[PDB]
Each structure stands twice: as C-alpha cells, then as structure tokens.
Enzyme design. Structure first.
Site, short mmCIF file in Angstrom:
data_model
loop_
_atom_site.label_atom_id
_atom_site.label_comp_id
_atom_site.label_asym_id
_atom_site.label_seq_id
_atom_site.Cartn_x
_atom_site.Cartn_y
_atom_site.Cartn_z
N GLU A 124 -45.81 9.76 -0.16
CA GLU A 124 -46.02 9.19 -1.48
C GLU A 124 -47.39 8.50 -1.52
O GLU A 124 -48.29 8.84 -0.74
CB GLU A 124 -44.87 8.25 -1.84
N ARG A 125 -47.56 7.54 -2.41
CA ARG A 125 -48.80 6.80 -2.55
C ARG A 125 -48.59 5.33 -2.20
O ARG A 125 -47.46 4.87 -1.98
CB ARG A 125 -49.35 6.92 -3.98
N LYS A 173 -43.06 14.63 -11.82
CA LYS A 173 -42.17 14.66 -10.67
C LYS A 173 -41.74 13.26 -10.24
O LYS A 173 -40.57 13.05 -9.90
CB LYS A 173 -42.84 15.38 -9.50
N1 LIG Z 1 -41.27 10.72 -20.34
C1 LIG Z 1 -42.63 10.68 -20.30
N2 LIG Z 1 -43.35 10.43 -21.41
C2 LIG Z 1 -44.70 10.39 -21.38
N3 LIG Z 1 -45.43 10.59 -20.27
C3 LIG Z 1 -44.83 10.85 -19.08
C4 LIG Z 1 -43.36 10.92 -19.03
N4 LIG Z 1 -43.03 11.19 -17.75
C5 LIG Z 1 -44.19 11.29 -17.05
N5 LIG Z 1 -45.26 11.09 -17.84
C6 LIG Z 1 -46.68 11.13 -17.40
O1 LIG Z 1 -46.82 12.00 -16.28
C7 LIG Z 1 -47.73 11.44 -15.33
C8 LIG Z 1 -47.24 11.71 -13.91
O2 LIG Z 1 -48.17 11.16 -12.98
P1 LIG Z 1 -47.94 11.26 -11.38
O3 LIG Z 1 -46.57 10.71 -11.05
O4 LIG Z 1 -49.15 10.67 -10.71
O5 LIG Z 1 -47.95 12.84 -11.09
P2 LIG Z 1 -46.61 13.64 -10.67
O6 LIG Z 1 -45.62 13.35 -11.78
O7 LIG Z 1 -47.05 15.08 -10.59
O8 LIG Z 1 -46.23 13.03 -9.34
C9 LIG Z 1 -47.80 9.94 -15.62
O9 LIG Z 1 -49.17 9.53 -15.70
C10 LIG Z 1 -47.12 9.75 -16.96
O10 LIG Z 1 -48.04 9.20 -17.90
MG LIG Z 2 -44.95 11.42 -7.40
#
Ligand SMILES: Nc1ncnc2c1ncn2[C@@H]1O[C@H](COP(=O)(O)OP(=O)(O)O)[C@@H](O)[C@H]1O
Ligand SMILES: [Mg+2]
Ligand SMILES: Nc1ncnc2c1ncn2[C@@H]1O[C@H](COP(=O)(O)OP(=O)(O)O)[C@@H](O)[C@H]1O
Ligand SMILES: Nc1ncnc2c1ncn2[C@@H]1O[C@H](COP(=O)(O)OP(=O)(O)O)[C@@H](O)[C@H]1O
Ligand SMILES: [Mg+2]
Ligand SMILES: [Mg+2]
Lengths: 354, 69, 355, 163, 354
Positions: free
Chosen positions: C185-186, C159
């Site tokens: 957010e964080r 997301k």
């Molecule tokens: N295009 C991509 N390719 C590889 N990994 C991805 C990609 N997009 C997101 N991610 C992975 O998804 C994770 C999302 O983490 P985070 O942002 O903390 O949770 P959320 O996306 O639910 O907010 C990241 O750690 C990242 O490594």
């Molecule tokens: Mg997020």
C-alpha cells in the site's frame, strides 16, 4: 618448510581488512579484491581520488560502483574504506548553493555550512508518526489550485511528454512561496528542493539564474546531477536530495522536493546494475524497479503534532513518449503517488498553457 | 566456474610433448557445431584467413583467442 | 544452547547468502536473526540452499550495514507472529512486532507464517449471500459468505475506496473479528485507515477491538512485501480454527504479493517468465489463496483487491487470481470518467451466487 | 586409460587426466604421499597462504610456490607438473579437491568402500563384494558396537497413515 | 623504452593486450601496433580484464593481427590537430590528414577525450537564429549557441536539411565552422568538399573557415564511435582559447550510439533495450555537454538524428531529445504528399518559442 618459502617470496603487507586491491575496473564498475570488514553500501576511497560505493559483495571479490571517472583507476590500485555508509550533508546552511550528489558545492561558493550528517538510504515514516494532509500548497497557477490542489505532505506526479509543461509546473510552485518565506511565519513557509537529475549542463544553469533574480534562490536547495557524470551519481540523486529536505520537516518547517525527472532516475539505476553481473527483469531493467521509486517517495509525508508538525512535498515529473502512460516506468510511479498531473501535448501547442 | 581451451582432451597433450606437427598453421578440431569449428592451434594464422579441413571443406578463422581459434 | 550460527558470505540486494557448518544448516522458510547496531534485528528468511554448507536467505529489511563474516543465528523455526485476541487493535509488522508504539503484544502463543493449506476432505461448500449495501453489488455479482472476493481494477479507478466503504458497513456489524492486512500500500493510506476505525468503534485503545492491523506497504524492501500476506493470514486463521469465528481478511492490494516475489527472483537463480514474471507464479499464488478458505471449524470471507497493470486483465497476475475467487468485482476506467461512483461493470462482474 | 569411476566430469577431470601418465613404471605409490604434503603446508601454516584467494600471483608468486613445494619438500617424479597446470589456468584456490580425487582411485580399484551401519565398515581388498561382506559383519558386530532413529521414524509414519 | 604489450585475444574490433610489466595502460589511451603498411594501427583502451591484461578497441581493421604481436603504448589519448591549421583540410579520427595536402602544421595537439564544462562556466542566452525557412522561423525557432536536432527517418530529408542551413547561415556567421561527419556515405563526403570550395568556404590557396572531419560508414566500429570526439576537439579550442562562435555540424549524430552498441557485446557488457549498450545515457551525455556555450565563446550545434526504422521511441532517438534546445522532427508521412521538406508542426518544439 612453510616459513622458509615465505621469506624468499610471498607478498608484502596490504591488509584486506580495511583496504583492498582493484582487480578489474571499467564502465563505472570496479571489482576490488578484498575488503572483508567493509559493510554494504559503504563509501570507498580509491588511491587516485575517485570515490566508490561497494554495492555487490561476493566471497572472493567486491563489486564497487565508482562515483566519477574510471580513467585514473587501473588494476592493482589501493581501495581504502571510509568506515561509513553513503551519507550526505544536511542542515539550514545548504540553502543558497548548488550542491551535487555527494554534498560537494559546485557553484563556487567555498564550503557548505553543514549542521549534521544524514545517510542517503533512510527509512520512511510509519503510520503512527504521520497525520492527514490539511495544509495548503499554493502553486500559483489558477488551473492547479482549483482543480487538483496539492498539500504539504502529499506526492503529486507530473506525467507528460517533452516540451509540454513538466518542468514549468514545478518551477512556478517554488517561486510562489516568496510571499510567505520573506516574512516571519515559519509555519507558512515552504523550502524548495530542486533535484535536476538527467538534465544537461545548460538546463541546470538556466533554472538557477531565473530563481536568483526573483528572490527565490535564498531558500532553495539545488541538486546538480547532470548526465555527463557516472551512473552511480545520477541514480543516487533521489536519495541524497531527500535527506537534506528531511531535516526541516523533523524540526518544525515545511519542505518541497522536486524529483525532475522520474524517468531519468530509472535509466541510471539499470545501467550500474547491468555492469555488476546481475540478471535483468522487464524492459532490460532491474528486478527492484518499482521498489526504488516507491521507497524514495514514501518518506515525503506529513508528520503529526508529536514529531514536530513538519511536512515534505514530492513533485516527481514523468517523461512520457507520445502520451503513452501505459508503460513500465509510467504505470509504476502513477500507482504509488497520491494523484498525478497529466500534461498532454495537444492542448499545449494551441496556446492553453499549461 | 572453470575455463575452456585445455579440457580433458586438450589438457592431456601438453604434459608430454605437443610437437611433431606444426601447430602454427595446422590444428586439431576440438569441437564442431552450428556452422562453427573450434580448432585447437593456429598460432601464426592471421585474422580472416582461409582454412581447409581434412574432408575438403573450406574454413575462415574469425576469432583468434588463446589456445583456440 | 546449540544455536546454528552462520557467516555472511555474499550480499547483493535483498538476497544474502549465509554460510553455516556441515549438518547444522537451517531448512527452507526459516527465520535467521542478525545483530545490528540498533535495538532491533535483521530478520532473514531462507529461500533455497546453494550447497557447500551455504544457503541463500532473503532479508526482510534493509541490507545496508552487513559485512562479510557477520554472525547469523538461526531461530530454528519459521517467522513467528502473535496470534489470539492480543493482536486486535495493534499495528503488527511482517515479523510480528508492534509498530503502533503501544508496548509489546502480550500473546500466549506464536504460530508460524508458513503453513500448509486445507485438504480436499476438510473443505465445506456453501451458497450464502452477503449483503454489502451497494445497488450494483446486490443485483449483479453478489458476494458469497465465507468465500474469496476480488475487486479488480486499474490505477485510479476505485480500488482503495471500494475496500474502505465495505468495511464501514459490514465489518462493523459482524459477529467475528476483522483482519486488515495491507501489502504493497502507501504511507498515507496506512495512517488514514487506523484513524477512521477508532472514531467508528472498530479499534478501541482503551476498550475492545475486533480488527487486526498488519503493516507493510511499499516503503520496505522486497522481502517484507512478499511476506506481508503470510503474516496477516496467520492471525485470521487462528480465530476461525481454534476459536471458531467468521473472520474477514482485507488485503490491499492482492496484486502486490505476486509482484514482490518477481523482484528477487532474478537474483535467486531463477529464469524469468512472461512479462518479466517468475516461473513459480501459479505455485506461489495457489499456496496462499487455498489457506484462506472456509473449513469445518469456521468461515473466512476474504475481500482482497486486485490491481490490474495499466488496465489489462490478460496479465499473468490478474488472470491467475480469477480462478480462486467466487465473486469478482471488475472495474473499468471508462465508466469512472462519466460520473459513475463507483465504476462497477454490470457485464464483466460475475459470481457463483447469481442463480 | 580411463577407469570406470566417473567422478563428475569437469571439476573431477583434473586428477583423472594426470593419473593416466602417472600409472606407468610403478609411479602410483609415490604420488599419494607427495600430494598430502602440498595441502598441509598451505592450510595450517599461515605463511604461504597469502596468494590462495588473491588474484595477483602472475609468474612471480605462481612459479615460486611450485618450486618450493617440490624441491625442499618430497617430490622428484612428475609431482611438480601438477601445480604448474593449476597456476596458469587459475586453479590454485581448490587444492583440496585435486588431492581428494587422487586417493579415491586407489581405494576403488584395490579395495571396497561404501558403508553399512553406525560408523564405517571394513573395506577389504579381496575380490567380490558378497564374500567379503558376510565375513566382516559377523566379526565387527561382536567386537565393539556400542550402538549409541531410523527404525523409530518408520514405525510412527505407518501408524499415522492408517488413522 | 615505452610500455610494450602483447596481443592475447582478438575478436573483431576488441583486441585484448596483455602487458608483461606491472605498469599497465589507463583507460582511453592510444596504443600503437606495427604491422607492415607505413600506417601501423590505433587502439583505444576501454577496460581492464585483470591479470596484467586490458581490453582495447582498435580504430581500424584488425585483419592480419596474430597472437603475440608488439603493442606499444603512446602514454596518452588519441590526439588531433587543433587551431587554424585544421581549417580547409580533411582530417580523420586519429588527427591524420586525408586530403593529400601534406601534414597539418599545428602548434598544439589536444586529446579527443576531455571533460565538459562545469556549472559555474556555463552561459545561457535566448538569441534567435534566423535560418530562412518559413516552417522554422515561426514554429520551432532555433537558438544561437545551442544544440539543434534534425530528427527523421531514412529518405525524409535529414541530409538535405543540414546542407541548406549551412549555405545561408554559416557563410556569413563570421566564426569558423566544424563539419564532422560520422556514419555518412562515401559520395556525400566528396560532394560536400567540392561544393564548399567553389563558394568560398574552404580555400586551398587562401583563408578557410570550415574544419572537415572524415569518417563514413565504410570504416570499422572503432573509427565511427571516435569520429565525434575528434571533430568536437577542434571546435572547442576556437571558443575557449580564442573566443569565437563555432558551428558544429554533425551528420549524423545517431551513428555515435549505433557504433558503440556493436562492440559492447565483445567487451563483457550485457545488452540493454533493443540490443543496445547499458551505458547509453552516460556515453551520450559526456559528448553533448561539451558542445555547449560557455563564458569564453558559444558553440551552435546543428546535428541531425536518424530515426530507427521510423520510430521515435527508440533508445538512440529518445535519449538525444533531452540535450537539444530546438528539435526538428521529419515525419515520413508528410514527405510523400509533396511537402518540401516534411517539417512536422505537431512534433517540432523549441525553447525560444515564447
Ligand atoms: N464513490 C466515489 N465518488 C467519487 N470519487 C471516487 C469514489 N471512489 C473513488 N473515487 C476517486 O478515485 C480515486 C482513487 O484513488 P487511489 O485510491 O489513489 O487509486 P486506486 O483507487 O486505483 O487505488 C480517488 O482519488 C477518489 O477521488
Ligand atoms: Mg489503493
Ligand atoms: N505558462 C506558459 N506560457 C508560455 N510558455 C510556457 C508556459 N509554461 C511553459 N511554457 C513553455 O514550455 C517549455 C517547456 O520546456 P521544458 O521545461 O524544457 O520541457 P518540459 O516542460 O516538458 O520539461 C518552455 O520552453 C516554455 O517556453
Ligand atoms: N526540399 C526538397 N524538395 C524535394 N526533394 C527533397 C527536398 N529535400 C530532400 N529531398 C529528397 O529527399 C531525399 C533524401 O535522400 P537521403 O539524404 O539519401 O536520405 P536522408 O534524407 O534520410 O538522409 C533526396 O533524394 C531528395 O530528393
Ligand atoms: Mg524539465
Ligand atoms: Mg544523410
């Protein structure tokens, strides 16, 4: 007349400005009638010697949560105000002693050489006083340093069931920093900060004895917070342990906090709020359940070069029930931290540790 | 913000003379509903004791608080 | 001056009851100032009125340090925020103050955060497509220009990475200005987003910027998180109505606005709803989503991100936001573990421009 | 005897219950002057107000305030029984609400009320309300009436709705 | 002249006592109530409602008490007999003998409410305890001086597991035993005393080494919740004042938390999860921490937990898993196949499995 009736009766002194009378007390809560000049979340001292924290301020009474046993507090006892908020000790002299939730020493080593006084409920760092996580936190495990590697300033969660490797992952990372803390490089050393909340009395004594025999308890803070105390002591274990580790990150050193566990801190906060005449939320918990765990973990961030260059690592362990990570307290902590370490119970019994 | 027991009907009987009938064993029914009967009185009545209404229905005094039963 | 001074009578959590005089009581959604010990202040928004010359106010910061009987002055209006071209490039807060250590925001006007939405006669329908650059967004559910976009997904699905990748290829080449307003957010996500925009040309400290930064993560209390969506939308609405520009509001996340109101709903005297939610879930979500639309003065492409509770689209905070969005980019947790980057659902994602 | 004045039902039933027994043998005129002396010697006095908000009292500081404000004050009838019912039920903190509801019963059954414009009206004790309002509005508009909002707000709202 | 009170309200086990004098009783204080049966009554104070009135909890039936009875205060808590005089006798929750063998001639009488051990008085070990079963000596091995938990549902094998281990470990342990049954059946109490007398555990005309404590489910809610504090006081005196490896056997341990939930709604506390009390983690942690091994002596706790309708995610089953070294969960699915007993190998874990 009005002056003639007060001379043959009325009351005595006992001003309600800086003091107060306890009207009702029980199950940790204590309704003190008075305390007009007492601020919110202030340290209150009773006449028997038990400390208190006024968290609910009404117009006729004042709900204070006792930090100990309510067997000595009765109706009509004097409750004096200290004038300050809920603070705790901090500094470089706290390394080597098992402190409690209020800064008192429980290991029997006398007094604690504190260099300052920091509050428990402190504000987190902003977006301008934070930098990217570029340092490397060597945990010692081969499966954790190559896959999900953690750094100085990030928050790595440790979800899992009981007897699966939750507390074993946080204990191995603190003992692996002995190669950098025994030398002279202050930028590579990382001080540990174990906050045992919700554990038993035998579990806290066994973990402190293993670190002292391997030359690791000299630079590690132990926050003793067993489940046999009051609900206010276990709920404030996360805010008191974060204030002592924040002094090293604001000066030029690295810290590593371990909130074991995150599931025990949520049950202690809901017990004190339910006894203070408050409405509950979901799963018989308070309304600000997600705000309590997100505020304490946001302060452990890596600072920039203009703030000292320090960082603080947070290791929160989440105790699950049968591998269910879709719960109320499990999904709230996983969406606030920067990653999580899932500890399944299927591969732990076969021999693949961790 | 207030309290029960003495309220309107039960608060206008103690200002004059609440005697005549024995309030230790008998009592006036102040409220009834959901299989309960808040009788005003019963001072000498023990816990879990058998009672009887005016129409012939039996009763069991469970809770015995101050002013009500 | 005739300042409405009030006295604090109750303080339990974020809710703080202030007692004023008869007739001089403030209205709802009014900012109440309070002098503390530092150089700042304690902003408090009036939610409801309990009566007897007293109104319950919700504090937008820490309630520690307030005693019974402190002075509580009223500002007379709502939470004013800085609008215009001076807010671009600076990190604003929920009360309209700078948090970037770059001096004060030199703004000529200050609009309130609480405002009514547009009427039915002022709505302007459109059917224009917006190219994002992804292969699964340009073929399945296409994003509409000037509409509301929702990136639904669970925790750890993708997301936060979906909103950051789209802003580096659409917002950097657009004619209007951006408005990144993060709510819930964080701490690490706020510092990484500001440093990436300075190296690409979106936020220039010595030149010109076209991206408004609004702080307000989960490190504050429940009052600052619920009011972060109204403060960030006030700056983007002024550029599309008074200036007439295609603003782009980026909310991350959109699910934090509904969860922040339910945390203080139990202490305000309201009964709980389903799954521990508030009773005014459909009323609070509709008042803020209708104001971020496209009128006759300008367009506003809202690219918010919804967070599903433990991968559940049948919740009260995820199903209520699906009727106020044109393009919905729902993400699944099963496609992210197979290697699909990102996990874009080709059957669950729908849009109104797919005709 | 219950008069048609409603006056809430839970909080306003304190003065309505005691008014039935006090309306016998002409004992309603002496209750008005005795109720005003109890509120003036506990508010602006700073002497006997040490147990107004405290939860102490308990017989000692509860029965001493009812005897000092009746024997040495101005009470001899059933005025001392009103303070004893509020001391055992923990109702001494709202003494202004019990004294304000007693004066509203004598002004409703023996006079007019409501209002009209500017300040108060006349509140006559004749009979009907139509024959007393027309004879008092012509004599009060001429004498005084400085006239120093409602008509200007209604005219501006009608012009904005038609534009 | 002792402190006399008057009964103001009585709703079940909760009896509100209104003291006429200013010297009110403290929390966890034993109160007497004369009636007319050569036994009187035992009431324990829980909290204070204010206005010279405190809410007490009776340890027997409150049927027959009128409004205004005399309530005398003892000045201390519910004391019980300790030492070597309690071995072989059947004591109750108030320390009185129920075996019809005269009074217990004890030298000292310690109270049932006492604090647990501190962090400096704890003593951890890793000595394995051989039980004799093939599923317990290889999977989850028990520890000597720790807390053992026998979790399981109804009809699985909870009462049969504690009886088989006491006939092959407690008979040749050397120290004294402490079989304190809380929430048991009427036929289980009489069958346990007759079997131990024919084997040499309890000798009525000789030397005994097993303390029996009565308290089945036929009593009220005050006697079932106070049955765990009476049995733990006799075992703690033999390990601290005498220094002996005591063996505490509770059957069952889940009856202590279920008895306090039924009386928590009448004391003013709000309900928690699944209609439980808000102080679930505070009440269970205060009693489990005192039954541990200290520096003067050890205490092998062999309690048994009851699953609520075959569910391990309940508030009385999941909260007791963090205060036991070895757990023995008994699944209901393996008991119907023919396994004697239904020892779940995928759920039973221990800390000595290394
Ligand atoms: N295009 C991509 N390719 C590889 N990994 C991805 C990609 N997009 C997101 N991610 C992975 O998804 C994770 C999302 O983490 P985070 O942002 O903390 O949770 P959320 O996306 O639910 O907010 C990241 O750690 C990242 O490594
Ligand atoms: Mg997020
Ligand atoms: N690398 C390892 N090798 C062998 N056993 C391990 C290893 N890591 C953990 N364990 C075992 O896992 C158990 C974890 O116990 P405990 O910390 O109480 O539960 P949790 O880890 O769930 O908090 C320990 O008793 C230990 O014997
Ligand atoms: N080793 C065993 N072999 C055969 N049956 C057993 C064994 N252990 C226990 N049982 C059976 O389990 C039942 C347990 O009954 P009970 O003690 O009333 O329920 P619970 O064990 O849940 O307390 C007994 O009726 C007994 O027949
Ligand atoms: Mg652990
Ligand atoms: Mg059994």
């Amino acid at each position: 007349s009005i002056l003639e009736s007060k001379i043959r009766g009325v009351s005595d002194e006992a001003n309600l400005d800086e003091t107060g009378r306890v009207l009702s007390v029980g199950d940790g809560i204590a309704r003190v009638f008075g305390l007009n000049n007492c601020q919110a979340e202030e340290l209150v001292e009773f006449a028997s010697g038990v400390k208190g924290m006024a968290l609910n301020l009404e117009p006729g009474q004042v709900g204070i949560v006792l930090f100990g046993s309510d067997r000595e507090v009765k109706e009509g006892e004097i409750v004096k105000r200290t004038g300050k908020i809920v603070d705790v000790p901090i500094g470089p002299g706290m390394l080597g002693r098992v402190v409690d939730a209020l800064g008192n020493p429980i290991d029997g080593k006398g007094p604690i050489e504190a260099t300052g006084y920091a509050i428990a409920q402190l504000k987190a760092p902003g977006i301008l006083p934070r930098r990217s996580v570029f340092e490397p936190m060597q945990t010692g495990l081969k499966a954790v340093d190559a896959l999900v590697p953690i750094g100085r300033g990030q928050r790595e969660l440790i979800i899992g069931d009981r007897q699966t490797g939750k507390t074993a992952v946080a204990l191995d990372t603190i003992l692996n920093q002995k190669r950098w803390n025994d030398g002279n490089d202050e930028s590579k050393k990382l001080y540990c900060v174990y906050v045992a909340v919700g554990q038993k009395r035998s579990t806290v004594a066994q973990l402190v004895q293993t670190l002292e025999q391997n030359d690791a308890m000299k630079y590690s803070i132990v926050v003793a917070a067993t489940a046999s105390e009051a609900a206010p002591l276990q709920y404030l274990a996360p805010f008191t342990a974060c204030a002592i580790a924040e002094w090293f990150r604001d000066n030029g050193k690295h810290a590593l906090i371990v909130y074991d566990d995150l599931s025990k801190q949520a049950v202690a906060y809901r017990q004190l709020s339910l006894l203070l005449r408050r409405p509950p939320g979901r799963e018989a918990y308070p309304g600000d359940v997600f705000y309590l765990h997100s505020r304490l973990l946001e302060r452990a961030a890596k600072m920039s070069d203009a703030n000292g260059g320090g960082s603080l690592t947070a290791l929160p362990v989440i105790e699950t029930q049968g591998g269910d990570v879709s719960a109320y307290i499990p999904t709230n902590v996983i969406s606030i931290t920067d990653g999580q370490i899932f500890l399944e119970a299927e591969l732990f019994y076969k021999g693949i540790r961790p | 913000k207030a309290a029960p027991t003495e309220v309107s009907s039960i608060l206008e009987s103690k200002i004059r003379v609440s005697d005549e009938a024995n309030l230790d064993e008998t009592g006036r029914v102040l409220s009834v509903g959901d299989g309960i009967a808040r009788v005003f009185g019963l001072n000498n009545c023990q816990a879990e004791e058998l009672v009887e209404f005016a129409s012939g229905v039996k009763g069991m005094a469970l809770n015995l608080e101050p002013g009500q039963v | 001056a005739g300042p409405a001074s009030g006295k604090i009578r109750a303080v339990i959590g974020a809710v703080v009851d202030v007692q004023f005089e008869q007739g001089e009581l403030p209205a709802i959604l009014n900012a109440l100032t309070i002098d503390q010990g530092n150089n700042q202040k304690l902003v408090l928004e009036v939610a409801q009125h309990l009566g007897e010359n007293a109104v319950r106010a919700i504090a937008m910061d820490g309630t520690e340090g307030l005693v019974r009987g402190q002075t509580v002055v009223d500002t007379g209006a709502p939470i004013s925020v800085p609008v215009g071209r001076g807010t671009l490039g600076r990190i604003i807060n929920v009360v309209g103050e700078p948090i970037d250590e770059r001096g004060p925001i030199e703004c000529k006007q200050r609009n309130p955060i609480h405002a009514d939405p547009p009427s039915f006669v002022e709505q302007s329908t459109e059917a224009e497509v917006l190219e994002t650059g992804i292969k699964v967004v340009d073929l399945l559910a296409p994003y509409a220009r000037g509409g509301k976009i929702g990136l639904f997904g669970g925790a750890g699905v993708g997301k936060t990475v979906f909103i950051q990748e789209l802003i580096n290829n659409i917002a950097k080449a657009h004619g209007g200005f951006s408005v990144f307003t993060g709510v819930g957010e964080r701490t690490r996500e706020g510092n990484d987003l500001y440093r990436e925009m300075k190296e690409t040309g979106v936020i220039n400290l010595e030149g010109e910027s076209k991206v408004a930064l609004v702080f307000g993560q989960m490190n504050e209390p429940p009052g600052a998180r619920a009011r972060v969506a109204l403060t960030g939308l006030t700056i983007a609405e002024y550029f599309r109505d008074e200036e007439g520009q295609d603003v782009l509001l980026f909310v991350d996340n959109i699910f934090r606005f509904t969860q922040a109101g339910s945390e203080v709903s139990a202490l305000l005297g309201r009964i709980p709803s389903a799954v521990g939610y508030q009773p005014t879930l459909a009323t609070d979500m509709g008042l803020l989503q209708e104001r971020i639309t496209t009128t006759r003065k300008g367009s506003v492409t809202s690219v918010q991100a919804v967070y599903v509770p433990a991968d559940d689209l049948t919740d009260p905070a995820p199903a209520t936001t699906f009727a106020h969005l044109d393009a919905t980019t729902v993400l699944s947790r099963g496609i992210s573990e197979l290697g699909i980057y990102p996990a874009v659902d080709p059957l669950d994602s729908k849009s109104r421009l797919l005709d | 005897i219950k008069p048609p004045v409603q006056l809430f039902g839970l909080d306003g039933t304190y003065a309505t219950a005691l008014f039935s027994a006090s309306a016998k043998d002409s004992s309603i005129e002496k209750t008005f002057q005795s109720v005003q002396k109890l509120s003036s010697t506990i508010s602006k006095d700073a002497k006997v107000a040490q147990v107004l908000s405290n939860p102490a009292l308990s017989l000692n500081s509860r029965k001493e305030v009812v005897s000092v404000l009746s024997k040495e004050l101005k009470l001899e009838p059933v005025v001392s029984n009103l303070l004893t019912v509020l001391a055992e039920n923990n109702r001494l903190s709202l003494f202004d609400s019990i004294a304000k509801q007693f004066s509203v019963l004598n002004d409703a059954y023996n006079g007019v009320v409501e209002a009209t414009v500017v300040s108060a009206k006349p509140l006559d004790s004749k009979i009907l309300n139509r024959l007393t309002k027309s004879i008092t509005n012509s004599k009060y508009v001429g004498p005084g009436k400085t006239l120093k909002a409602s008509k200007v707000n209604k005219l501006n709202k009608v012009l904005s709705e038609t534009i």
